[PDB]
């Protein structure tokens, strides 16, 4: 139905936002991992 199709687009749009937020978290994890390696460098030094 028209209502179901309209609700499908809204939920699909929220899915893209969730994926974008998840992708941003992955980028943050890589940055945090690099900082951990940098922190370990001082201890290793």
């Amino acid at each position: 139905d028209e209502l179901n199709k309209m609700q499908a687009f809204i939920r699909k749009e929220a899915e893209e936002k969730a994926k974008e937020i998840q992708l941003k978290a992955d980028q943050e994890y890589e940055i945090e991992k690099t900082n951990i390696v940098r922190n370990e460098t001082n201890n290793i030094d």
């Binding site: 139905d1 179901n4 199709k5 609700q7 499908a8 687009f9 809204i10 939920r11 699909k12 929220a14 899915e15 893209e16 969730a18 994926k19 998840q22 992708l23 978290a25 992955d26 994890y29 890589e30 991992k33 690099t34 951990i36 390696v37 940098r38 370990e40 460098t41 290793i44 030094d45």
Partner: protein, 53 residues
């Protein structure tokens, strides 16, 4: 509804993408191991200089 189920599948695909984001972080964790190895490599170079002295 069928449209809602398709939206749930898109959410499930996003959930899979969210799981893939952890896999992307896991993929980036390989660079973290290389970054950790680079940190040890810098210490190894410092240790080599200390060893030379």
């Amino acid at each position: 509804n069928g449209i809602a189920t398709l939206l749930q599948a898109e959410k499930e695909a996003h959930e899979i993408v969210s799981k893939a984001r952890k896999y992307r972080q896991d993929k980036l964790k390989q660079a973290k191991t290389d970054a950790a190895k680079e940190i040890d490599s810098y210490k190894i170079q410092k240790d080599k200089e200390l060893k030379e002295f």
